[PDB]
Amino acid sequence: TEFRSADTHNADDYPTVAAVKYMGELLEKKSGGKHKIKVFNKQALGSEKETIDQVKIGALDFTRVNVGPMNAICPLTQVPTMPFLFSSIAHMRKSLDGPVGDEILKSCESAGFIGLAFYDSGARSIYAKKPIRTVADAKGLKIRVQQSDLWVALVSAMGANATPMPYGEVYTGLKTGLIDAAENNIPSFDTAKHVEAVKVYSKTEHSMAPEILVMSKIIYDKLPKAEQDMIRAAAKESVAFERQKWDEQEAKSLANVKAAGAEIVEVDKKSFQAVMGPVYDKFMTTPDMKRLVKAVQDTKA
Ligand SMILES: O=C(O)[C@H]1O[C@@H](O)[C@H](O)[C@@H](O)[C@@H]1O
């Protein structure tokens, strides 16, 4: 069959878009030409939030979204959203590739989603019209976050005025002054044109919230077991491809924003990490959550 998958990013060569297309090619091979995937980027099938609900009801086969908007519906996705959980990108990758990531993916089935893969999204940092070098600078900042209570709390802990909005509204919000800041990785800041509106990128690196690729359980459950396995394998094998493309995009977008006049500011990251204890207290509240946070931070370099 020809499955459909959604992506919010406009660029046809964005790493997450390229990665699901690659998955589709692997799936065609593994299935002897039976199954294919068509990727609808440019949020053609809806915002992230909208596509998650379409997948839930079986109207959309796959969606590639950030863990952020999955935080309430698949609560263990909150774990890798947590601020300063991972010590580095390498640590994130090892954690998500291993039993921690796999447990989180499997946990989404109770909510109607087959978790298939985590894709790299770098580290997220604040961008604004002024530098944010300490949490004191963040106090009162009118900043957009993704649509989850955890995300609101995470940035609120910095003293900022966190405002949940869908991604597609961010560019205009920054241009018109409806919001004064947002936060994201460099490729997003670049490709969504946020850099056109605000130039100061303060490297708070306050989350490494990865992407998650989910399939509709309703659709998955109707396929033969052997074909379910093909889909799982194609997804898993696409992660290495996504990561290589992601590394390349990080470099390209950094060059782009620097050339466009972005001011990249180094910060006292401990200023920001020092305020996050209560976010763990308020959100990492179940035994599974506590065990997974510990498992991540027990992971050896
Ligand atoms: O901030 C956001 O909403 C966006 O952040 C980007 O990093 C994710 O790639 C994209 O999936 C999210 O929709």
UniProtKB/Swiss-Prot annotation:
Keywords: Disulfide bond, Periplasm, Signal, Sugar transport, Transport. D-glucuronate binds at residues 9, 48, 64, 124, 144-146, 167, 184, 188, 211. D-galacturonate binds at residues 9, 48, 64, 124, 144-146, 167, 184, 188, 211. One of its GO terms (molecular function) is carbohydrate binding. It is found in: Periplasm. Its main location: periplasm. GO terms for cellular component: outer membrane-bounded periplasmic space. Disulfide bonds join 74-108. One of its GO terms (biological process) is transmembrane transport. Solute-binding protein that binds D-galacturonate and D-glucuronate (in vitro). Probably part of a tripartite ATP-independent periplasmic (TRAP) transport system that mediates solute transport into the cytoplasm. The complex is comprised of an extracytoplasmic solute-binding protein and a heteromeric permease formed by two transmembrane proteins. Belongs to the bacterial solute-binding protein 7 family. This is Solute-binding protein Bpro_3107.
